[PDB]
Design a protein around this nucleic acid. Structure first.
Ligand code: T1C
Ligand code: K
Ligand code: K
Ligand code: K
Ligand code: K
Ligand code: K
Ligand code: K
Ligand code: K
Ligand code: K
Ligand code: K
Ligand code: K
Ligand code: MG
Ligand code: MG
Ligand code: MG
Ligand code: MG
Ligand code: MG
Ligand code: MG
Ligand code: MG
Ligand code: MG
Ligand code: MG
Ligand code: MG
Ligand code: MG
Ligand code: MG
Ligand code: MG
Ligand code: MG
Ligand code: MG
Ligand code: MG
Ligand code: MG
Ligand code: MG
Ligand code: MG
Ligand code: MG
Ligand code: MG
Ligand code: MG
Ligand code: MG
Ligand code: MG
Ligand code: MG
Ligand code: MG
Ligand code: MG
Ligand code: MG
Ligand code: MG
Ligand code: MG
Ligand code: MG
Ligand code: MG
Ligand code: MG
Ligand code: MG
Ligand code: MG
Ligand code: MG
Ligand code: MG
Ligand code: MG
Ligand code: MG
Ligand code: MG
Ligand code: MG
Lengths: 159, 238
RNA sequence: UAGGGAAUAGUUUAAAAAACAUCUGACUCACAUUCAGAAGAUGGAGGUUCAAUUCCUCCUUCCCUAACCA
RNA sequence: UCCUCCGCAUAAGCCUGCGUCAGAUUAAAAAACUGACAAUUAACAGCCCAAUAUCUACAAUCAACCAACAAGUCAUUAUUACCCUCACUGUCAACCCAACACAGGCAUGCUCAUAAGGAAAGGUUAAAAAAAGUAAAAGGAACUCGGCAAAUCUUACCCCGCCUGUUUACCAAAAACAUCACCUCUAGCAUCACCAGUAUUAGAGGCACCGCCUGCCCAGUGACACAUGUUUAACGGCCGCGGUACCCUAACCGUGCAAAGGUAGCAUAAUCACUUGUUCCUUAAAUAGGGACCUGUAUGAAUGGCUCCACGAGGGUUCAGCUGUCUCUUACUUUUAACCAGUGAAAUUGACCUGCCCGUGAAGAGGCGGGCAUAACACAGCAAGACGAGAAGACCCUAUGGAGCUUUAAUUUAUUAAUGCAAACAGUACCUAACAAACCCACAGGUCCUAAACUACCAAACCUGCAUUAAAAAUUUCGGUUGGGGCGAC
RNA sequence: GCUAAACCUAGCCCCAAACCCACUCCACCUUACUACCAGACAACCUUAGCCAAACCAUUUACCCAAAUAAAGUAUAGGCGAUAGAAAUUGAAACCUGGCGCAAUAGAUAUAGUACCGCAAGGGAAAGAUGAAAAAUUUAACCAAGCAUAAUAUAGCAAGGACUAACCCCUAUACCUUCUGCAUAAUGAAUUAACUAGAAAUAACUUUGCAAGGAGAGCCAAAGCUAAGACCCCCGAAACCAGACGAGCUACCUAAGAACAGCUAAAAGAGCACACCCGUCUAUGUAGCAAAAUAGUGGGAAGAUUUAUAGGUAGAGGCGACAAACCU
């Protein structure tokens, strides 16, 4: 979203101008996820995926601010979780092939704890955090029956 | 704002359905077409424009009896209630269609053309060249969109290469596949264009609002323009 | 009242020609047409310019437009 | 005694807003004021339905007979599911929208005439002027811009518009707009307008029923075709200069110019140089009106021309009558008025102890000069002055002040459409010079001054980026001088 | 002597410091504040313009993360108006204070209430004894306006006077605006309160230090540091952005309602009520009324009139074009 001077002359009228990218619908296969995706892309994305030697490399290498898509960051979290877990759901019947994929991408492996939070928006993260912390309250009946026993137990040992 | 099209019913009936006026507004509530508004209330009678529509468990040519020919507020032509088997439907009446007639709905094309009786529906390939036809479709099974107004007809001009050339009421030629169905004869109410509105108020009865009083100076578009007939429109794919 | 334009053979148009009118002849019984000859004007006055049909300035003359707001 | 619009209900609105008691004191004068306490009770009304499929051509009008078009408000069945029974809310009033206890606005039913609902006069006097009425001698439009208003209850016509209709709420109702009719333009088609339509259609416009017509012009400008072009019921336009029958005029003559040279009609007026033309009607008298003629600075054909029925709160002319319009006013009634009592506004106002005449003066003095007049103060009238009041003149000019509108004003194409190109993506390629010199098989046949290189449309109606042309718009300005400005001139 | 007058609190202002705010039982996104049914609707997207440039058309400062300094320098710009860095440099922690207001001030605030507006929105006014009111009996005197107490030839209202108020003589209000105003040019009933000159450059004056000055930076060929001293108020028609508006009115949608009698009978026919409209006259003109009343009118089965709910929204709508109507 910008402006332009008509006929590239500052003394002419200043006009609003929007340059939009040329978008193509193409399909892409993920080795780690063993899935085909129909993604809207630019010609640039296709040039970047080539320079990365594939979609898995492109998603795994490119950082958040250069992917510029929540979908790319979900693909990353997805790929990263299979690598962190060595997930056997990838080609369940081909352990040899499955290990060739995971070795190919061994550079990007991170702990599963960290991979779960990769790409989450702040609002997603809080919901993830709120759900992890969602626990039913403990009835005070159980809490006091523990204090009583421990209170009776300590009294017995002393004498 | 909250405009909802009346054309919401999904099953064919012959019961006249209530329709809602638009006033020439679109769904935004804004005037889209000027000069529409008011008029007598009307009910819509669903016209079946697919003449060769065999019943659910039936197939092939079939006949129908004309039960009634009556007035239609929603179009300039007349409509005929026909009954065949266990089904009734509204169709466009032809010039001389009357109660008690029997009409033929056929999809058969033979080496020899049939004798074209008014009110019968045949594929274009089955008709003699020069027959007067109405209620034409552009693709086989699409349903009649052409030659539907009162007193109208087209002419079968040629039958070449499994296609039929016809002349539209506007005199422009139109090419379709020979399996397209048409009805023989002219649409009913042949004297419809001789009607005299008579007084301004009768145009209000028909749902027309008066023209703007604003004066417009005529521009280059005005004045007689003698241009050739457009080239034949083809709906055939090679 | 105030601005603009225009005055070319008798006529009407050109840029000093043309068609008429006129004059002379031929053709005709005669006339007309036609044919062949001939003459015929740059509004007047005032300039300049190497040279004034496009240029003056004025007069004389005819036209055109404008003459509005309270 | 008088009035009667009314009134009573429902709806909507409003929300305790003339019940009681106790207070104060009741109201544009003398409780609807304050505080307490009461109060409208459901049958009327509101608040409603288990599912899925399926059904539903035949108006209404006393619905019969007839006759219509603008073609219409009222309907199920099948099979499952289904024991449970009167909750909740409105219910008052002298009421609401109009700043008000406002002559306004306000839907339906019923009565209207009333069974219901109300009081025009605070008391007096009975001047002007003013308002609203009634009556009026003789005359009867002499009034006046006009018969406005009144009275009476008429005739004939002219213009314009055909007609009913529509409009500037709050200065214009009209001749303006629409309109039946006629014609021009665009469009071959569906699932949100047009339209559940389909060229006898549907959109954009002109003009204005009907009758008689609607002439000529495509050069220019626009549209369309963009191959010579087509198109006026598109924008528009539709000739001169000389001469010839006494004059007038020119059937006629000469020459020139244009795309065509204004045709048919019509013309002393919604139209008007002279002009109040001229003539015939009309009056005693006509710058009026009618009929004609003259003929058009600048009449004229769907920017419609010319007639004509009917119609009009349109503009104009008129017979008869009618009358206070007038000659020429008068009389009476009510209102207002004036006086008494109650209540009690507004604009306005430098201060005022606020005369006249002449003169003067920022050019029209109560106020200055010179004269003249002159105890003081209420009330009623009047409208000559106070350049009276009201609204920082709507005229006119000025302001490098606005704004609306229109364009061939300048700037621009963001947007929109079309087009090209590039991007994306089909998806496969050998297709235009034979000429027999003793050498040539009984045939599908060798050579000489000719036996060659040899991508097809870039690969769709999309989307992006670039240009290009349009349409629609947007932003901004509209110099000065000037014996006011404009115009002219500078 | 009335009406009045007077008051000192309520609170408020600017800083500092410190990082605030929940259910309170029941109700509340449907017509909010409404115990209790089959759904799926979902957020993001450059401000513009006034104004300055004495028009206007490119352009015209707007905290963006340390005071100072570099520097109004580099640079940008119808190279105009104006705009304008960076490198580099690197001062300071002690909340409870005030040469702030004191009822027309200070918050709009006693309250976002009353009141006004359909809505968005706009938006007030005011109190005052005393230790005790379970002491109601103790003070003056003060604006305009009045009252006590109208008035006596003559004149900007006074002045000079005078024994004497007046009589005599002299004397053309004021402000603004103008060549020039008693002007019959502007404004002003009057009282009270409120209500309008803000700062650089250079210079000057008065100190300090002085070839130096200055508490880094900046100036210096008597400079340099410091100080003093200086440039108003109210007013358009507009322009743009985002909201709110169709309970009026224009047009439309859904579904209603009304239209007596008489004539004629095909009905946008006639007469004529209810009803709708508004031709003409008079009245009224701060009205009864921010468009009415009386009479007279036009239409009144229709392109009629009208109740209800809904729709279209300002670069817009709507329009039988009147540039109509859109509270
Ligand atoms: C002053 N002249 C130019 C003139 C003026 C007017 N009218 C006006 O100027 C009106 N002006 C207003 C609009 C009122 C401001 C005019 O109205 C006229 C005329 C011209 C005459 C010429 C007449 C002439 N004859 C008959 C004396 C004549 O020969 C012709 C002719 N065409 O050749 C006429 O038509 C003539 O009769 C005529 O009509 C004239 C005007 O109408
Ligand atoms: K009228
Ligand atoms: K006349
Ligand atoms: K005459
Ligand atoms: K009329
Ligand atoms: K007077
Ligand atoms: K003068
Ligand atoms: K300006
Ligand atoms: K004066
Ligand atoms: K003056
Ligand atoms: K004045
Ligand atoms: Mg039309
Ligand atoms: Mg029109
Ligand atoms: Mg007279
Ligand atoms: Mg007279
Ligand atoms: Mg009258
Ligand atoms: Mg006309
Ligand atoms: Mg009006
Ligand atoms: Mg009206
Ligand atoms: Mg007005
Ligand atoms: Mg009127
Ligand atoms: Mg008209
Ligand atoms: Mg006609
Ligand atoms: Mg014509
Ligand atoms: Mg003629
Ligand atoms: Mg006449
Ligand atoms: Mg004239
Ligand atoms: Mg004339
Ligand atoms: Mg003309
Ligand atoms: Mg025309
Ligand atoms: Mg008629
Ligand atoms: Mg009428
Ligand atoms: Mg008349
Ligand atoms: Mg008479
Ligand atoms: Mg006067
Ligand atoms: Mg005055
Ligand atoms: Mg003024
Ligand atoms: Mg300006
Ligand atoms: Mg401006
Ligand atoms: Mg200029
Ligand atoms: Mg000037
Ligand atoms: Mg002048
Ligand atoms: Mg000029
Ligand atoms: Mg002056
Ligand atoms: Mg004065
Ligand atoms: Mg003045
Ligand atoms: Mg005054
Ligand atoms: Mg601007
Ligand atoms: Mg009538
Ligand atoms: Mg209307
Ligand atoms: Mg108009
Ligand atoms: Mg106008």
């Amino acid at each position: 979203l910008g402006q332009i001077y008509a006929n590239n002359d500052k003394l002419s009228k200043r006009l609003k101008k929007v340059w939009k990218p040329q978008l193509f619908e193409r399909e892409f296969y993920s080795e780690i996820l063993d899935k085909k995706f129909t993604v809207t892309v630019t010609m640039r994305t296709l040039d970047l995926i080539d320079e990365a030697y594939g979609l898995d490399f492109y998603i795994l290498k490119t950082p958040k601010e250069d992917l510029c898509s929540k979908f790319g960051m979900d693909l990353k979290r997805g790929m990263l979780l299979r690598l962190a877990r060595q997930d056997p759901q990838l080609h369940p019947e081909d352990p040899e092939r499955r290990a060739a994929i995971y070795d190919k991408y061994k550079e990007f492996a991170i702990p599963e704890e960290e991979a779960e939070w990769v790409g989450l928006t702040l609002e997603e993260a809080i919901e993830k955090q709120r759900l992890l912390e969602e626990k039913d309250p403990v009835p005070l009946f159980k809490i006091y029956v523990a204090e009583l026993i421990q209170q009776l137990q300590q009294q017995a040992l002393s004498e | 704002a909250n405009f909802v099209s009346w054309k919401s019913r999904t099953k064919y009936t012959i019961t006249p359905v209530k329709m809602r006026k638009s006033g020439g507004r679109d769904h935004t509530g804004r005037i889209r077409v000027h000069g529409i508004g008011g008029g007598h209330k009307q009910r819509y009678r669903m016209i079946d424009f697919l003449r060769f529509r065999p019943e659910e468990t039936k197939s092939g040519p079939f006949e129908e009896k004309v039960i009634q020919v009556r007035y239609d507020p929603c179009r300039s032509a007349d409509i005929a209630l026909v009954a065949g088997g266990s089904r009734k439907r509204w169709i466009i009446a032809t010039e001389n269609m009357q109660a008690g007639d029997t009409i033929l709905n056929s999809n058969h094309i033979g080496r020899m053309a049939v004798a074209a009786r008014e009110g019968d529906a045949h594929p274009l390939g089955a008709l003699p060249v020069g027959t007067l036809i109405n209620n034409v479709e552009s693709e086989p099974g699409r349903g009649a969109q052409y030659i539907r107004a009162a007193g109208t007809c087209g002419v079968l001009l040629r039958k070449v290469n499994g296609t039929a050339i016809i002349q539209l009421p506007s005199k422009r030629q139109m090419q379709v596949l020979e399996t397209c169905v048409a009805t023989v004869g002219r649409v009913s109410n042949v004297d419809h264009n001789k009607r005299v509105i008579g007084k301004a108020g009768r145009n209000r009865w028909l749902g027309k609002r008066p023209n703007s009083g604003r004066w417009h100076r005529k521009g280059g578009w005005a004045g007689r323009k003698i241009r050739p007939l457009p080239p034949m429109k083809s709906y055939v794919k090679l």
